[PDB]
Amino acid sequence: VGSKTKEGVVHGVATVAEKTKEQVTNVGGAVVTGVTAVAQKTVEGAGSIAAATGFVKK
Amino acid sequence: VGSKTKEGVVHGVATVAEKTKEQVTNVGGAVVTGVTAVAQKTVEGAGSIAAATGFVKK
Amino acid sequence: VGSKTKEGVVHGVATVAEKTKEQVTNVGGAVVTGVTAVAQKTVEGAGSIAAATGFVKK
Amino acid sequence: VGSKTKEGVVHGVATVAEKTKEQVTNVGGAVVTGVTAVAQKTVEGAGSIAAATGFVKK
Amino acid sequence: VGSKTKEGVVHGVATVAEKTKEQVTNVGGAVVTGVTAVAQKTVEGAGSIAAATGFVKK
Amino acid sequence: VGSKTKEGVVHGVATVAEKTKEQVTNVGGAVVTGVTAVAQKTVEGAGSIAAATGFVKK
Amino acid sequence: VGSKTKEGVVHGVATVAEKTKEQVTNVGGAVVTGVTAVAQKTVEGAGSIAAATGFVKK
Amino acid sequence: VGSKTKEGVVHGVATVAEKTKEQVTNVGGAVVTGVTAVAQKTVEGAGSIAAATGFVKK
Ligand SMILES: Cc1cc(-c2ccc(/N=N/c3ccc4c(S(=O)(=O)O)cc(S(=O)(=O)O)c(N)c4c3O)c(C)c2)ccc1/N=N/c1ccc2c(S(=O)(=O)O)cc(S(=O)(=O)O)c(N)c2c1O
Ligand SMILES: Cc1cc(-c2ccc(/N=N/c3ccc4c(S(=O)(=O)O)cc(S(=O)(=O)O)c(N)c4c3O)c(C)c2)ccc1/N=N/c1ccc2c(S(=O)(=O)O)cc(S(=O)(=O)O)c(N)c2c1O
Ligand SMILES: Cc1cc(-c2ccc(/N=N/c3ccc4c(S(=O)(=O)O)cc(S(=O)(=O)O)c(N)c4c3O)c(C)c2)ccc1/N=N/c1ccc2c(S(=O)(=O)O)cc(S(=O)(=O)O)c(N)c2c1O
Ligand SMILES: Cc1cc(-c2ccc(/N=N/c3ccc4c(S(=O)(=O)O)cc(S(=O)(=O)O)c(N)c4c3O)c(C)c2)ccc1/N=N/c1ccc2c(S(=O)(=O)O)cc(S(=O)(=O)O)c(N)c2c1O
Ligand SMILES: Cc1cc(-c2ccc(/N=N/c3ccc4c(S(=O)(=O)O)cc(S(=O)(=O)O)c(N)c4c3O)c(C)c2)ccc1/N=N/c1ccc2c(S(=O)(=O)O)cc(S(=O)(=O)O)c(N)c2c1O
Ligand SMILES: Cc1cc(-c2ccc(/N=N/c3ccc4c(S(=O)(=O)O)cc(S(=O)(=O)O)c(N)c4c3O)c(C)c2)ccc1/N=N/c1ccc2c(S(=O)(=O)O)cc(S(=O)(=O)O)c(N)c2c1O
Ligand SMILES: Cc1cc(-c2ccc(/N=N/c3ccc4c(S(=O)(=O)O)cc(S(=O)(=O)O)c(N)c4c3O)c(C)c2)ccc1/N=N/c1ccc2c(S(=O)(=O)O)cc(S(=O)(=O)O)c(N)c2c1O
Ligand SMILES: Cc1cc(-c2ccc(/N=N/c3ccc4c(S(=O)(=O)O)cc(S(=O)(=O)O)c(N)c4c3O)c(C)c2)ccc1/N=N/c1ccc2c(S(=O)(=O)O)cc(S(=O)(=O)O)c(N)c2c1O
Ligand SMILES: Cc1cc(-c2ccc(/N=N/c3ccc4c(S(=O)(=O)O)cc(S(=O)(=O)O)c(N)c4c3O)c(C)c2)ccc1/N=N/c1ccc2c(S(=O)(=O)O)cc(S(=O)(=O)O)c(N)c2c1O
Ligand SMILES: Cc1cc(-c2ccc(/N=N/c3ccc4c(S(=O)(=O)O)cc(S(=O)(=O)O)c(N)c4c3O)c(C)c2)ccc1/N=N/c1ccc2c(S(=O)(=O)O)cc(S(=O)(=O)O)c(N)c2c1O
Ligand SMILES: Cc1cc(-c2ccc(/N=N/c3ccc4c(S(=O)(=O)O)cc(S(=O)(=O)O)c(N)c4c3O)c(C)c2)ccc1/N=N/c1ccc2c(S(=O)(=O)O)cc(S(=O)(=O)O)c(N)c2c1O
C-alpha cells in the first residue's frame, strides 16, 4: 500500500526585489509586510500564516 | 493501493518587483502587504493565509 | 506498506533583495517584516507563522 | 513497513540582501524583522515562528 | 557636461529551468546551448556572444 | 565634466536550475553549455563570450 | 573632472543548481560546461570568456 | 580630477550546487567544467577566462 504524499511543498522559487525605499509606519494596530516561499502543514491544527490582527479600543 | 497526493503545492514561481518607493502607513487597524509563493494544507484545521482583521472601537 | 511523506518542505529558493533604504517604524502595535523560505509541520498543534497581533487599549 | 518522512525541511536556499541602510525603530510594541531559512516540526505542540505580539495598555 | 551612460546593462532577471532530462549530442560541428543574463560592450571591437560556427569538410 | 559610466554591468540575477539528468556528449567539434550572469567590456578588443568553434576536416 | 566608471561589473547573483546526475563526455574536441558570475575588462586586448575551440583533423 | 574606477569587479554572489553525481570523461581534447565568481582586468593584454582549446590530429 505504497502512498506518496507531497503536501504543503514549495520549490523552485526565485524572487527579485529592487526597491529604492521601502518604509512601514505603524501607529496602533498590526502590519505584516513581506512573505515569500512559506509552507505549512497542520494536523488537528489551525494554520494561520500572515495574520495582522489589530484591536484598537478605548 | 498506491495513491500519490500532490496537494497544497507551489513550484516554478519567479516574481520580479521593481518599485522606486513603497510605503505602508497604518493608523488603527491592520495591513497585510506582500505575499508570494505561499502554500498550506490543514486537516481538522482552519487555514487563513493573509487575514488583516481590524477592530476599531470606543 | 512503504509510505513516503514529503510535507512542509521548501527547497530551491533564491531571493535577491536590493534596497537602498528600508525602515520599519513602530509605535504601539506589532510589525512582522521579512520572512523567506520558512517551513512548518505540526501535529495536534496550531501553526502560526507570521502573526503581528496588536492590542492598543486604554 | 519502511516509511520515509521528510517533514519541516528546508534545503537549497540562497538569499542576497544588499541594503544601504536598514533601521527598525520601536516604541511600545514588538517588531520581528528578518527571518530566512527557518524550519520547525512539533508533535502535541503549537508552532509559532515569527510572532510579534504587542499589548499597549493604560 | 555631465553625461550618464547606462549601456550593455542587464539587471533584474530571474529564470527558472525545470527539466527532467536535457541532453546535447554533438558529432562534427558546434553547439551553444544555454545563455542567460549576458552583457557586453565593445569599442573598436566585434562582439559575438553565442556563435556556434561549424566547418565540416573533407 | 562629471561623467558616470555603467557599462557591461549585470546585477540582480537569480536563476534556479532543477534538472534530473543533464548530459553533454561530444564527438569531434565543440560544445558550450551553460553560461549565466556573464559580463564584458573591451576597448580596442574583440569580445566573444560563448563561441563553440568547430573544424572537422580530413 | 570627476568621472566614475562601473564597467565589467557583476553583483547580486544567486544561482541554485539541483541536478541528480550531470555528465560531460568528450571524445575529440572541446567542452565548456558551467560558467556563472564571470566578469572581464580588457584594454588593447581581446576578451574571450567561454570559447570551446575544436580542431579535428587527419 | 578625482576618478573612481570599479572595473572587472564581482561581489555579492551565492551559488548552491546540489549534485548527486557529476562526472567529466575526457578522451582526446579539453574540458572546462565549473567556473563561478571569476574576475579579470588586463591592459595591453588578451583575457581568456575559460578556453578549452582542443587539437586532435594524425
Ligand atoms: C525617489 C527619490 C526621492 C528623493 C527624496 C528627496 C527629498 C525627500 N524629502 N525631502 C523633504 C521632506 C520634507 C520637507 C519638509 S516637511 O515635510 O514639511 O517636514 C519641509 C521642508 S522646507 O520647509 O525646508 O522647505 C523640506 N525641504 C522638506 C524636504 O526637503 C524625500 C522624502 C525623497 C530623492 C531622490 C530620489 N531618487 N533618486 C533617483 C535619481 C536618479 C536615479 C537614476 S539616474 O542617475 O537619473 O539615472 C536611476 C535610477 S535606477 O537605475 O535605479 O532606475 C534611480 N532609482 C534614480 C533615483 O532613485
Ligand atoms: C537613497 C537616496 C536618498 C535621498 C535622500 C536625501 C535627503 C533626505 N532627506 N533630507 C532632509 C530631510 C528633512 C529636512 C528638513 S525637515 O523635514 O523639516 O526635518 C528640513 C531641511 S531644511 O529646512 O534645512 O531645508 C532639510 N534640508 C531636510 C533634508 O535635507 C532623504 C530622507 C533621502 C536622496 C537620494 C537617494 N538616492 N541616491 C541616488 C542617486 C544616484 C544613484 C545612481 S547615479 O550615480 O545617479 O548613476 C545610481 C544608482 S543604482 O546604480 O544603484 O541604480 C542609485 N541607486 C543612485 C541613488 O540611489
Ligand atoms: C509620525 C507622525 C506622528 C503623529 C502623531 C503624534 C502624536 C499623536 N498623539 N497621540 C494621541 C493624542 C491624543 C489622544 C487622545 S486625546 O488627547 O484625549 O484627544 C486620546 C487617546 S485614547 O482615548 O485612545 O486613549 C489617544 N490614543 C490619543 C493619542 O493617541 C498622534 C495620534 C499622532 C502625527 C503625524 C506624524 N507624521 N508623520 C510624518 C512626519 C514626517 C514625514 C516626512 S518629513 O521629512 O519629516 O517632512 C516625510 C514623509 S514622506 O514624504 O516620505 O511621505 C512622511 N510620510 C512623514 C510622516 O509620515
Ligand atoms: C517620531 C514622531 C513621534 C510622534 C509622537 C510623539 C509623542 C506622542 N505622544 N503620545 C501621547 C500624548 C498624549 C496622550 C494623552 S494626553 O496627554 O492626555 O492628551 C493621553 C493618552 S491615553 O489616554 O490613551 O492614555 C495617550 N496615549 C497620549 C499619547 O499616546 C505620540 C503619540 C507620537 C509624533 C510625530 C513623530 N514624527 N516623526 C517624524 C519626524 C521626522 C521625520 C522626518 S525628518 O527628516 O526629521 O524631517 C522625515 C520623515 S520621511 O520623509 O522619511 O517620511 C519622517 N517620516 C519623519 C517622522 O515620521
Ligand atoms: C525618536 C522620537 C521620539 C519621540 C518621543 C519622545 C517622547 C515621547 N513621550 N512619551 C510620552 C509622553 C506623554 C505620555 C503621557 S501624558 O504626559 O499624560 O500625555 C501618558 C502616557 S500613558 O498613559 O500611556 O502612561 C504615555 N505613554 C506618554 C508617553 O509615552 C514620545 C511619546 C515620543 C518623538 C519623536 C521622535 N523622532 N524620531 C526621529 C528623530 C530624528 C530623526 C531624524 S534626524 O536626523 O534627527 O533629523 C531623521 C529621520 S529619517 O530621515 O531617517 O527618517 C528620522 N526618522 C528621525 C526620527 O524618526
Ligand atoms: C536512461 C534511463 C533512465 C531512466 C529514468 C527513469 C525515471 C526517471 N525519473 N524518475 C522519477 C520517478 C518518480 C518521481 C517522482 S514520484 O513518482 O512522486 O515518486 C517525483 C519527482 S519530483 O518531485 O522531483 O517532481 C520525480 N522527479 C520523479 C522522477 O524523476 C529518470 C530520471 C530516469 C530509467 C532507465 C534508463 N535506461 N535504462 C536502460 C537503458 C538501456 C537498456 C538496454 S540498451 O543498451 O538500450 O540496449 C537494454 C536493456 S534489456 O535488454 O536488458 O531489456 C535495458 N534494460 C536497458 C535499460 O534498462
Ligand atoms: C551515438 C551514435 C553514433 C553513431 C556513429 C558511429 C560511427 C560513425 N562512423 N563514422 C564514420 C564512418 C565512415 C566515414 C567515412 S567512410 O568509411 O569512407 O564511408 C568517411 C568519412 S570522411 O570522408 O568525412 O573522412 C567519415 N567522417 C566517416 C565517419 O565519420 C558515425 C558517422 C556515427 C551512429 C548512431 C548513434 N546512435 N546514437 C544513439 C544510440 C543510442 C540511443 C538510445 S539507447 O538507449 O542506446 O537505445 C536512446 C536514445 S533516445 O531515446 O533518448 O532518443 C538515443 N537518442 C540514442 C542515440 O542517439
Ligand atoms: C558512443 C558511440 C560512439 C560511436 C562511435 C564509435 C566509433 C567511431 N569510429 N570512428 C570512425 C571509424 C572509421 C573511420 C574511417 S574508416 O575506418 O576508414 O572507415 C575513416 C575516417 S577518416 O577518413 O575521416 O579519417 C574516420 N574519421 C573514421 C571514424 O571517425 C565513431 C565515428 C563513432 C557510435 C555509437 C555510439 N553509441 N553511443 C550510445 C550507446 C549507448 C547509449 C544508450 S545505452 O544505455 O547504452 O543503451 C542510451 C542512450 S540514450 O537513451 O540516453 O539516448 C544513448 N544515446 C546511447 C548512445 O548514444
Ligand atoms: C550508474 C548507476 C546509478 C544508480 C543510481 C540509482 C539511484 C540513484 N539515486 N538514488 C535515490 C534514491 C532515493 C532518494 C530519495 S528517497 O527515495 O526519499 O529515499 C531522496 C532523495 S533527495 O532527498 O536528495 O531528493 C534522493 N536524492 C534519492 C536518490 O538520489 C543514484 C544517484 C544512482 C544505480 C545503478 C547504477 N548502475 N548500475 C549498473 C551499471 C551497469 C551494469 C551492467 S553494464 O556494465 O552496463 O553491462 C550490467 C549489469 S548486470 O548484467 O549484472 O545485470 C548491472 N547490474 C549493471 C548495473 O547494476
Ligand atoms: C564510451 C564509448 C567509446 C567508444 C569509442 C571507442 C573506440 C573508438 N575507436 N577509435 C577509433 C577507431 C578507428 C579510427 C580510425 S580507423 O581504424 O582507420 O578506421 C582512424 C582514425 S583517424 O584517421 O582520425 O586517425 C581514428 N581517429 C579512429 C578512432 O578514433 C571510438 C571512435 C569510440 C564507442 C562507444 C562508447 N560508448 N559509450 C558509452 C558506454 C556505456 C554507456 C552506458 S552503460 O552503463 O555502459 O550501459 C550508459 C549510458 S547512459 O544511459 O547514461 O546514456 C551511456 N551514455 C554509455 C555510453 O555513452
Ligand atoms: C571507456 C571507453 C573507452 C573506449 C576506447 C578504448 C580504446 C580506444 N582505442 N583507441 C584507438 C584504437 C585504434 C586506433 C587506430 S588502429 O588500431 O589502427 O585502428 C589508429 C588510430 S590513428 O591512426 O588516429 O593514430 C587511433 N587513434 C586509434 C585509437 O585512438 C578508444 C578510441 C576508445 C571505448 C569505450 C569505452 N567505454 N566506456 C564505458 C564503459 C562502461 C560504462 C558504464 S558501465 O557501468 O561499465 O556499464 C556506464 C556508463 S553510463 O551509464 O554512466 O553512461 C558509461 N558511459 C560507460 C562507458 O562510457
Swiss-Prot record, chains A, B, C, D, E, F, G, H:
**Phosphoserine found at:** S48
Coiled-coil region list: none
Q: Which residues bind Cu cation?
A: H11
Tell me where on the tree of life, at the top rank, the source sits.
Eukaryota
Subcellular location as annotated: Cytoplasm; Membrane; Nucleus; Synapse
Q: How is it modified after translation?
A: Phosphorylated, predominantly on serine residues. Phosphorylation by CK1 appears to occur on residues distinct from the residue phosphorylated by other kinases.
Q: Where are the sequence repeats?
A: 3-17, 18-28
Q: In which tissues is it expressed?
A: Highly expressed in presynaptic terminals in the central nervous system. Expressed principally in brain.
Which disease does the UniProt record connect it to?
Genetic alterations of SNCA resulting in aberrant polymerization into fibrils, are associated with several neurodegenerative diseases (synucleinopathies). SNCA fibrillar aggregates represent the major non A-beta component of Alzheimer disease amyloid plaque, and a major component of Lewy body inclusions. They are also found within Lewy body (LB)-like intraneuronal inclusions, glial inclusions and axonal spheroids in neurodegeneration with brain iron accumulation type 1.
- Family, per the entry? Belongs to the synuclein family.
What is the UniProt domain comment for this protein?
A: The 'non A-beta component of Alzheimer disease amyloid plaque' domain (NAC domain) is involved in fibrils formation. The middle hydrophobic region forms the core of the filaments. The C-terminus may regulate aggregation and determine the diameter of the filaments.
Q: How does it assemble?
A: Soluble monomer. Homotetramer. A dynamic intracellular population of tetramers and monomers coexists normally and the tetramer plays an essential role in maintaining homeostasis. Interacts with UCHL1. Interacts with phospholipase D and histones. Interacts (via N-terminus) with synphilin-1/SNCAIP; this interaction promotes formation of SNCA inclusions in the cytoplasm. Interacts with CALM1. Interacts with STXBP1; this interaction controls SNCA self-replicating aggregation. Interacts with SNARE components VAMP2 and SNAP25; these interactions allows SNARE complex assembly and integrity.
What does the function comment of this entry state?
Neuronal protein that plays several roles in synaptic activity such as regulation of synaptic vesicle trafficking and subsequent neurotransmitter release. Participates as a monomer in synaptic vesicle exocytosis by enhancing vesicle priming, fusion and dilation of exocytotic fusion pores. Mechanistically, acts by increasing local Ca(2+) release from microdomains which is essential for the enhancement of ATP-induced exocytosis.
Please identify the protein, giving its name as recorded. Answer: Alpha-synuclein
Organism per entry: Homo sapiens
Residue range from the parent sequence? 40 to 97 of 140
